[PDB]
């Protein structure tokens, strides 16, 4: 029996990247052919596994992480990357055994005048350790003066909103992302 990937791939709403979403799928068959030819993916890259040989993988669970970022940020969903998304929202380790699929979703995830559902973390103290989820909304202190939960100079709310319009260049348009993580 083949893996139930549509529930994650075809789901109507996707998580914001900072609060990325996690499905455990187990005891099934991951087949590269069926998966790749199911849609028009703009990125599909596997790490530590041979694409041809997904059927031959021997795993208890596959972990399906999904979320939305912008096109220019898709580069960062990969082992050993750096930047906003890879540092403060979603971090892949270097011993990464899985795949990373993505596709332009301007048609689902963009309204004229703006969709603001999708947020990203912009400031954090330490960098994210792989597969760690930070959904805290603590005011980020950039200076010596403490913030006391209030927002202002050197005291920034740590999440901002993509403003997803259809008008944007392809780099700033939304992309849906699924990360298969086998174990």
């Amino acid at each position, epitope marked *: 029996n083949l893996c139930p990937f549509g529930e994650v791939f075809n789901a109507t709403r996707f998580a914001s990247v900072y609060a990325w979403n996690r499905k455990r799928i187990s005891n099934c068959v991951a087949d590269y052919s069926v998966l790749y030819n199911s849609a028009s993916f703009s990125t599909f890259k596997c790490y530590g596994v041979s694409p041809t040989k997904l059927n031959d993988l021997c795993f208890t669970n596959v972990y399906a992480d999904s979320f939305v970022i912008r096109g220019d940020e898709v580069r960062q969903i990969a082992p050993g990357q750096t930047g906003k998304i890879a540092d403060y929202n979603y971090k892949l380790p270097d011993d990464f055994t899985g795949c990373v699929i993505a596709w332009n979703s301007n048609n689902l995830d963009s309204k004229v005048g703006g969709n603001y559902n999708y947020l990203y973390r912009l400031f954090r*103290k330490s960098n994210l350790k792989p597969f760690e989820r930070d959904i805290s909304t603590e005011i980020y*202190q*950039a*200076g*010596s*003066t*403490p913030c006391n939960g209030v927002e*202002g*100079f*050197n005291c920034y709310f740590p999440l901002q909103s993509y403003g997803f319009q259809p008008t944007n260049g392809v780099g700033y348009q939304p992309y849906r992302v699924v990360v298969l993580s086998f174990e």
Partner: single-chain antibody
Amino acid sequence: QVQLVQSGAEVKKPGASVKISCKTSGYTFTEYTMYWVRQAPGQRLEWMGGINPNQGDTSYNQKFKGRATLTVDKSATTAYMELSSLRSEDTAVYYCARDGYPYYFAMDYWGQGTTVTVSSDIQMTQSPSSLSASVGDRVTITCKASQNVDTNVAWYQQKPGKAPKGLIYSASSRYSGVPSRFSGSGSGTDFTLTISSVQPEDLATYFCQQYNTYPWTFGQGTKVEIKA
């Protein structure tokens, strides 16, 4: 090494404008906030405002808003401050200083300073205002804050004719390289600076500072004379 290098001295008629610069080197410029501190001739140190070079956001002291404008040029790693419509009250020395957060609180590096010559706030009180000691005495200087400031108090030392240099941040921690004879103390509203075996080179004026909220404020200064 960190270095803050300010533009040279300026002479301006009443009414003119002056844009004094502060060229940084030694560190990631966009990751440290920049403040401007005024020292009117024989007066308290005064925090004028600050700019965050990552975003270009500013906070000004109400006394200096609309007199002063703070900008940066990331491409030149340079902070700028423009004083408009100069009056004679504006003849002073202007310092740029770096917020050392989060490794060392408060202003951990100052510029040489630029002399410009024209022709509910948290109160900080120091005692004594003036002091005379002999090599080897301990000296004690206290600072009373008009409101609670936890341990967000720093002390600076201003040797004669130079910029302030940090000694203590966070009430009791020493800046990098500061001599161990300086120790700071206290909490809440009462702070003390102690110099333990005073050396001739300690001839300086010493200032406390709170950074518990904006605007930052300084004490009036404590002159320390060393008899030989």
